Amino acid sequence: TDRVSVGNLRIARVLYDFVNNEALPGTDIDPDSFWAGVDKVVADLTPQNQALLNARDELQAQIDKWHRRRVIEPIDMDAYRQFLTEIGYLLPEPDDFTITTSGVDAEITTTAGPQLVVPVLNARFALNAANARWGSLYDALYGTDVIPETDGAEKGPTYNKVRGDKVIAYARKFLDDSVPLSSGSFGDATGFTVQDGQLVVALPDKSTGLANPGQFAGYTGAAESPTSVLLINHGLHIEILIDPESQVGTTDRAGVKDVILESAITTIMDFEDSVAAVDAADKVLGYRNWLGLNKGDLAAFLRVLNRDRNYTAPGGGQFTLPGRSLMFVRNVGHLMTNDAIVDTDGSEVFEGIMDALFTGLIAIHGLKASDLINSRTGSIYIVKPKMHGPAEVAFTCELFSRVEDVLGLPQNTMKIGIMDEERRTTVNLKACIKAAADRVVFINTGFLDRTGDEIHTSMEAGPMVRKGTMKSQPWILAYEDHNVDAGLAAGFSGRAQVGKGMWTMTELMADMVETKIAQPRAGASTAWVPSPTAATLHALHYHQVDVAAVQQGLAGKRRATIEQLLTIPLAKELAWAPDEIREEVDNNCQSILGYVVRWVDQGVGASKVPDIHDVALMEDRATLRISSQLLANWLRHGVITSADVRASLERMAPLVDRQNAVAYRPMAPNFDDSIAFLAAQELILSGAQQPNGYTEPILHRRRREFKARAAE
Numbered sequence: 001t002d003r004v005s006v007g008n009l010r011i012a013r014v015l016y017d018f019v020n021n022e023a024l025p026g027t028d029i030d031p032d033s034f035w036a037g038v039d040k041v042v043a044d045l046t047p048q049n050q051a052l053l054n055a056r057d058e059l060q061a062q063i064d065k066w067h068r069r070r071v072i073e074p075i076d077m078d079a080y081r082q083f084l085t086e087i088g089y090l091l092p093e094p095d096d097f098t099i100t101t102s103g104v105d106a107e108i109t110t111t112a113g114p115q116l117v118v119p120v121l122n123a124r125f126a127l128n129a130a131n132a133r134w135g136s137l138y139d140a141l142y143g144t145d146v147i148p149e150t151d152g153a154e155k156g157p158t159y160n161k162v163r164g165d166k167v168i169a170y171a172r173k174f175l176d177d178s179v180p181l182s183s184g185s186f187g188d189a190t191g192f193t194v195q196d197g198q199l200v201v202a203l204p205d206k207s208t209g210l211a212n213p214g215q216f217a218g219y220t221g222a223a224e225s226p227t228s229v230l231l232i233n234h235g236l237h238i239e240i241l242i243d244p245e246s247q248v249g250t251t252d253r254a255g256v257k258d259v260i261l262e263s264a265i266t267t268i269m270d271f272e273d274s275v276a277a278v279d280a281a282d283k284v285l286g287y288r289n290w291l292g293l294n295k296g297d298l299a300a301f302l303r304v305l306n307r308d309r310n311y312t313a314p315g316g317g318q319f320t321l322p323g324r325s326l327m328f329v330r331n332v333g334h335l336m337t338n339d340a341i342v343d344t345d346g347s348e349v350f351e352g353i354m355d356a357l358f359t360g361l362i363a364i365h366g367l368k369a370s371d372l373i374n375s376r377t378g379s380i381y382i383v384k385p386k387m388h389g390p391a392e393v394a395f396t397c398e399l400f401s402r403v404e405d406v407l408g409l410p411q412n413t414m415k416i417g418i419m420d421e422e423r424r425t426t427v428n429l430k431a432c433i434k435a436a437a438d439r440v441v442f443i444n445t446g447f448l449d450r451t452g453d454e455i456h457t458s459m460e461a462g463p464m465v466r467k468g469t470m471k472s473q474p475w476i477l478a479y480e481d482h483n484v485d486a487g488l489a490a491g492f493s494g495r496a497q498v499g500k501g502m503w504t505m506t507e508l509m510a511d512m513v514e515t516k517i518a519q520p521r522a523g524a525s526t527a528w529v530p531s532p533t534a535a536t537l538h539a540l541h542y543h544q545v546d547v548a549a550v551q552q553g554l555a556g557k558r559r560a561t562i563e564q565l566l567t568i569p570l571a572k573e574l575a576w577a578p579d580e581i582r583e584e585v586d587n588n589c590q591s592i593l594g595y596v597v598r599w600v601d602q603g604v605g606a607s608k609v610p611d612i613h614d615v616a617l618m619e620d621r622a623t624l625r626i627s628s629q630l631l632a633n634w635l636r637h638g639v640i641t642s643a644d645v646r647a648s649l650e651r652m653a654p655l656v657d658r659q660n661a662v663a664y665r666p667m668a669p670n671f672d673d674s675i676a677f678l679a680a681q682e683l684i685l686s687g688a689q690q691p692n693g694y695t696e697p698i699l700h701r702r703r704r705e706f707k708a709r710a711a712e
């Protein structure tokens with residue numbers, strides 16, 4: 001066979017070799033001890049892993065049955081709440097406490113700023129993300145719709161000076177708003193110098209300093225004619241590049257070439273919802289990238305990781321700043337198994353357990369010199385998604401503890417970023433944080449998964465509101481506030497991130513800049529962006545909003561009740577016309593097909609897919625979880641018929657085919673000959689029966705089916 005025997009396990013050879021030849025050397029872990037550990041941890045924790053999965057199903061069955069026996073229109077909230085408490089769904093809230101997590105880096109405990117999420121299987125993208133710690137504001141403004149492409153300001157094949165000037169003026173205002181001069185505007189600056197350790201800005205008829213000289217962080221080049229000036233605001237750096245001989249500098253009144261923003265402070269290297277990995281070959285591609293990132297030798301010319309940045313202090317001494325985003329890794333959650341390892345019965349091993357062992361092993365390299373150090377404070381940062389309730393958090397705690405022992409790492413080295421993205425976590429959040437009180441480095445509202453769970457949990461209650469309506473329903477607004485309240489009450493300020501979710505409209509940057517400011521205004525010290533460009537633009541918000549002061553002001557407040565959290569997003573009687581229903585169906589089918597076709601045929605786990613209004617959306621598994629669950633819910637309650645679904649899928653399919661074009665295999669007109677098309681259909685028609693509406697069981701099965709056919 002193509003497998004290696006270790007105790008009860010049979011490990012795919014490709015994975016075995018990868019760990020031995022690439023991951024283990026340099027960690028000082030004895031290979032025999034490692035592998036024995038893998039067998040032992042898998043043997044010991046699998047039963048509990050399974051019990052937790054069975055408990056989800058049992059809770060969901062009871063809730064389904066609660067709704068079916070009811071019939072009374074307005075849900076009786078006190079009865080419902082009492083029921084959830086009876087079945088162990090809603091648990092008692094623990095007494096107040098403060099987290100004790102230690103050895104965490106400044107980028108997490110203290111700095112407020114953007115957090116970038118990127119598929120770890122794409123080496124190019126992962127490299128750009130790691131390097132996105134610094135980014136060009138001019139490139140972000142000029143390249144996106146933040147500067148409207150009005151008459152005369154259009155993007156052309158070459159530099160448009162009218163447009164460039166708008167970019168320059170936008171940035172000058174940003175400087176005025178962020179690091180104000182004692183008098184006058186950056187708009188009128190003619191030059192910058194450093195004198196007696198102070199920044200001096202030349203204006204036309206006078207010179208001025210910063211209103212707050214402490215915002216002067218340093219410079220490069222000669223004090224008397226620097227090549228750049230470095231400022232800091234709300235803990236984030238801004239660098240003005242000075243080069244009158246450059247394309248842009250020549251047109252600028254002070255010779256400014258660009259303004260660089262400290263952008264993606266941290267990055268989450270994702271093994272979960274943004275990637276398609278269904279076997280040992282896929283997992284190894286991902287692990288190898290994660291390894292190269294931690295060793296600092298990942299290279300895709302040849303794209304490489306950036307070095308730290310050198311500056312001159314105001315007084316004239318030297319210092320450096322991190323040139324790379326501080327990396328988390330997102331492991332998969334408790335649900336899935338993967339045949340990369342099977343036992344003697346042929347049973348697949350739980351994937352989350354494997355990720356903990358393998359990504360944790362690999363992360364050791366990031367704690368040491370690259371022939372440079374991810375975590376200088378000695379932590380490994382793992383995001384754990386899709387947990388349901390505090391027992392599941394406790395299980396993750398014990399899993400990490402056992403892995404630490406296998407890896408010979410100190411206890412509590414492996415830190416947890418907690419996704420608050422399932423209903424049973426939301427309503428037990430304080431208890432969940434408590435279960436990880438010494439490991440937690442963030443909580444984050446994964447609002448898309450959370451929306452999927454909301455629909456699945458109350459699937460039997462009645463038909464839900466439209467997808468677009470969900471983002472503004474009472475339950476979700478209360479969930480957002482409740483998350484911030486819980487983190488602040490647990491002492492997260494100055495210790496751990498309070499984070500919010502992803503902006504998915506990748507081309508609507510003007511809208512993001514206008515709207516996403518709500519997140520740090522709500523006291524979030526970080527929030528998710530899909531790209532380095534969006535990281536730079538989102539950074540703007542942290543310069544405008546003093547998140548630390550916002551969090552301080554929110555202290556003690558309790559702004560969401562349990563009743564609000566439990567407000568099921570049921571649609572009102574006769575809420576939609578035939579045309580609105582048709583739109584929702586087509587919108588969901590197009591998005592499902594666009595994403596699924598690339599998942600199943602090409603193993604791409606995150607894709608831009610134009611919705612029904614032709615808005616580009618970054619789709620991942622969570623957005624698919626919503627679309628499929630919504631249609632499943634509408635089909636369950638007779639809003640639409642199975643023919644509506646079929647016709648819509650059949651309608652949208654040729655359009656999606658058109659949207660694609662070398663490793664692409666058309667779904668139409670032979671729909672039922674396309675594994676990808678059938679996958680999409682199955683996600684909808686079996687939606688109600690998937691545990692918690694999770695999409696992986698079907699996606700993994702169908703992707704594997706596709707690969708097997710392709711191999712013959």
Ligand SMILES: O=C(O)C(=O)CC(=O)c1cccc(Br)c1
Nearest residue numbers: 273446447448449502618620622
């Ligand atoms: O909202 C949540 O459940 C997330 O966890 C979001 C998520 O991973 C995502 C969504 C769209 C694009 C990308 Br990249 C990631």
Ligand SMILES: [Mg+2]
Nearest residue numbers: 060061064065
């Ligand atoms: Mg049932």
Ligand SMILES: [Mg+2]
Nearest residue numbers: 421446449622
């Ligand atoms: Mg999620």
Ligand SMILES: [Mg+2]
Nearest residue numbers: 234543545546
């Ligand atoms: Mg301020």
